[PDB]
Design an enzyme around this catalytic site. Structure first.
Site, mmCIF file in Angstrom:
data_model
loop_
_atom_site.group_PDB
_atom_site.id
_atom_site.type_symbol
_atom_site.label_atom_id
_atom_site.label_comp_id
_atom_site.label_asym_id
_atom_site.label_seq_id
_atom_site.Cartn_x
_atom_site.Cartn_y
_atom_site.Cartn_z
ATOM 1 N N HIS A 1 44.364 49.091 24.486
ATOM 2 C CA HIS A 1 45.242 50.180 24.074
ATOM 3 C C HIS A 1 45.439 50.238 22.566
ATOM 4 O O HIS A 1 45.750 51.317 22.035
ATOM 5 C CB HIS A 1 46.581 50.220 24.827
ATOM 6 C CG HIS A 1 47.327 48.933 24.873
ATOM 7 N ND1 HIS A 1 47.155 48.029 25.900
ATOM 8 C CD2 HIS A 1 48.353 48.463 24.125
ATOM 9 C CE1 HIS A 1 47.971 47.008 25.722
ATOM 10 N NE2 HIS A 1 48.725 47.257 24.666
ATOM 11 N N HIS B 1 50.289 45.752 15.175
ATOM 12 C CA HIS B 1 49.278 46.679 15.652
ATOM 13 C C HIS B 1 49.618 48.057 15.101
ATOM 14 O O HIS B 1 50.671 48.259 14.490
ATOM 15 C CB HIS B 1 49.223 46.688 17.170
ATOM 16 C CG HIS B 1 50.506 47.119 17.781
ATOM 17 N ND1 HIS B 1 51.543 46.242 18.043
ATOM 18 C CD2 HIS B 1 50.934 48.346 18.152
ATOM 19 C CE1 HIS B 1 52.556 46.922 18.552
ATOM 20 N NE2 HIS B 1 52.229 48.198 18.556
ATOM 21 N N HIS C 1 49.241 52.559 15.932
ATOM 22 C CA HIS C 1 48.971 53.701 16.798
ATOM 23 C C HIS C 1 48.448 54.791 15.893
ATOM 24 O O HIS C 1 48.936 54.927 14.766
ATOM 25 C CB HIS C 1 50.237 54.199 17.451
ATOM 26 C CG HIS C 1 50.975 53.166 18.207
ATOM 27 N ND1 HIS C 1 50.876 53.010 19.575
ATOM 28 C CD2 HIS C 1 51.786 52.189 17.759
ATOM 29 C CE1 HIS C 1 51.651 52.006 19.938
ATOM 30 N NE2 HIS C 1 52.192 51.491 18.852
ATOM 31 N N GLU D 1 54.103 57.535 16.274
ATOM 32 C CA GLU D 1 54.982 57.570 17.441
ATOM 33 C C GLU D 1 56.337 58.155 17.038
ATOM 34 O O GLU D 1 56.752 59.189 17.570
ATOM 35 C CB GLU D 1 55.092 56.153 18.017
ATOM 36 C CG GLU D 1 53.762 55.701 18.531
ATOM 37 C CD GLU D 1 53.824 54.654 19.615
ATOM 38 O OE1 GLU D 1 54.487 53.625 19.424
ATOM 39 O OE2 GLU D 1 53.222 54.902 20.666
ATOM 40 N N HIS E 1 53.250 48.806 13.545
ATOM 41 C CA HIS E 1 54.352 48.107 14.164
ATOM 42 C C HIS E 1 54.210 46.618 13.957
ATOM 43 O O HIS E 1 53.262 46.004 14.460
ATOM 44 C CB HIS E 1 54.381 48.394 15.655
ATOM 45 C CG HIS E 1 54.800 49.793 15.950
ATOM 46 N ND1 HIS E 1 54.567 50.455 17.136
ATOM 47 C CD2 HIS E 1 55.447 50.679 15.163
ATOM 48 C CE1 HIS E 1 55.117 51.646 17.114
ATOM 49 N NE2 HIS E 1 55.616 51.831 15.905
ATOM 50 N N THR F 1 57.187 50.894 23.201
ATOM 51 C CA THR F 1 56.631 52.228 23.355
ATOM 52 C C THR F 1 55.419 52.249 24.280
ATOM 53 O O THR F 1 54.826 53.314 24.450
ATOM 54 C CB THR F 1 56.232 52.810 21.986
ATOM 55 O OG1 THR F 1 55.095 52.079 21.506
ATOM 56 C CG2 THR F 1 57.400 52.809 21.020
HETATM 57 N N1 LIG Z 1 54.484 49.558 20.504
HETATM 58 S S1 LIG Z 1 55.693 48.452 20.421
HETATM 59 O O1 LIG Z 1 56.931 49.043 20.888
HETATM 60 O O2 LIG Z 1 55.722 47.920 19.086
HETATM 61 C C1 LIG Z 1 55.256 47.137 21.490
HETATM 62 C C2 LIG Z 1 55.287 45.800 21.065
HETATM 63 C C3 LIG Z 1 54.947 44.702 21.862
HETATM 64 C C4 LIG Z 1 54.538 44.825 23.167
HETATM 65 N N2 LIG Z 1 54.177 43.650 23.945
HETATM 66 C C5 LIG Z 1 53.394 42.450 23.576
HETATM 67 O O3 LIG Z 1 52.934 42.374 22.399
HETATM 68 C C6 LIG Z 1 53.038 41.189 24.483
HETATM 69 O O4 LIG Z 1 52.777 39.943 23.863
HETATM 70 C C7 LIG Z 1 52.140 38.992 24.676
HETATM 71 C C8 LIG Z 1 52.068 39.277 26.105
HETATM 72 C C9 LIG Z 1 51.452 38.435 26.983
HETATM 73 C C10 LIG Z 1 50.948 37.327 26.629
HETATM 74 C C11 LIG Z 1 50.938 36.985 25.187
HETATM 75 C C12 LIG Z 1 51.551 37.819 24.203
HETATM 76 O O5 LIG Z 1 50.375 35.920 24.812
HETATM 77 C C13 LIG Z 1 49.630 35.387 26.003
HETATM 78 O O6 LIG Z 1 49.742 34.226 26.031
HETATM 79 C C14 LIG Z 1 49.227 35.948 27.075
HETATM 80 C C15 LIG Z 1 50.314 36.588 27.598
HETATM 81 C C16 LIG Z 1 54.489 46.171 23.646
HETATM 82 C C17 LIG Z 1 54.851 47.272 22.823
HETATM 83 ZN ZN LIG Z 2 53.498 49.846 18.835
#
Ligand SMILES: NS(=O)(=O)c1ccc(NC(=O)COc2ccc3c(c2)OC(=O)CC3)cc1
Ligand SMILES: [Zn+2]
Length: 257
Positions: A61, A91, A93, A103, A116, A195
């Site tokens: 994604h 990361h 978008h 976003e 982000h 998000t």
């Molecule tokens: N767009 S947003 O709102 O900024 C936004 C920011 C962050 C997320 N979620 C994540 O990053 C998840 O991190 C992880 C998840 C799983 C594992 C990890 C690290 O490490 C591992 O060991 C395997 C498992 C979603 C959205």
């Molecule tokens: Zn994000």
């Protein structure tokens, strides 16, 4: 599974993730005239001098630049926050065209991309526990506009050939995220969510007013990435943004007059 296509995109996510219709969803439009200056907000404290980047991953994604978050090395504090939040990954978008991709929007304006920088509250011990808490994350959002190149982004751009497809990763040590920040740390802040699914309502959003400029060639290279895995019809990784969600019972506060 969920994605950004016509058949699995943001309008479908609520079926597997009902919180998608919740009370503090992100992103939102930032109406600059309705955001109120809050003089009790403190300056943001970004302490990235000891950041330890490790790896870059195409997760299907976006791509994440991941950091060693096992000690207090790269931390965000101050601003609206209580306590210390550790950087785990950043990361972006971005759009298929320079006119869309962010976003958050600013008076309905869309930037070409949005960075982000994701941090978790150390009082919760690790990231998985933090996302279960209303004050578990602090995400620093930075808009990208197309113009002059951002020198500090070029190392990211140049490794993307090696992670073209979902599940590919590459070593990415010694990357300095300070090279991605604008001059000013003036910000807007409001309570929101991840998000992307699982859309958890665990984020204090801190969105910088000053965008960074990136070149057309830099964002061009983001658009050559693929959502698909190696060996499976090519789908360009573009328009991986969720549109603005209803503000509901929330106020956006500004750190600046
Ligand atoms: N767009 S947003 O709102 O900024 C936004 C920011 C962050 C997320 N979620 C994540 O990053 C998840 O991190 C992880 C998840 C799983 C594992 C990890 C690290 O490490 C591992 O060991 C395997 C498992 C979603 C959205
Ligand atoms: Zn994000």
């Amino acid at each position: 599974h969920w994605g950004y296509g016509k058949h699995n995109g943001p309008e479908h996510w609520h079926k597997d993730f009902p919180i998608a219709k919740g009370e503090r969803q992100s992103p939102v439009d930032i109406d600059t005239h309705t955001a109120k200056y809050d003089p009790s907000l403190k300056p943001l404290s970004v302490s990235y001098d000891q950041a330890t980047s490790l790896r870059i991953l195409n997760n299907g994604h976006a791509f994440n630049v991941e950091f060693d978050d096992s000690q207090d090395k790269a931390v965000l504090k101050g601003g609206p926050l209580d306590g210390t939040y550790r950087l785990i990954q950043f990361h972006f978008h971005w759009g298929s065209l320079d006119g869309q991709g962010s976003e958050h929007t600013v008076d309905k304006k869309k930037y070409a991309a949005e960075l982000h920088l994701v941090h978790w509250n150390t009082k919760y011990g690790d990231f998985g526990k933090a996302v279960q808490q209303p004050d578990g994350l602090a995400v620093l959002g930075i808009f990208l506009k197309v113009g002059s190149a951002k020198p500090g982004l070029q190392k990211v751009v140049d490794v993307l050939d090696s992670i073209k497809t979902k599940g590919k990763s590459a070593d990415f040590t010694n990357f300095d995220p300070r090279g991605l920040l604008p001059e000013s740390l003036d910000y807007w802040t409001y309570p929101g969510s991840l998000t992307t699914p699982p859309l958890l309502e665990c984020v204090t959003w801190i969105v910088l007013k000053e965008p960074i400029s990136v070149s057309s060639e830099q964002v061009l290279k983001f658009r050559k990435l693929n959502f698909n895995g190696e060996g499976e019809p090519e789908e360009l990784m573009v328009d991986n943004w969720r549109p603005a969600q209803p503000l509901k019972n929330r106020q956006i506060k500004a750190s600046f007059k």
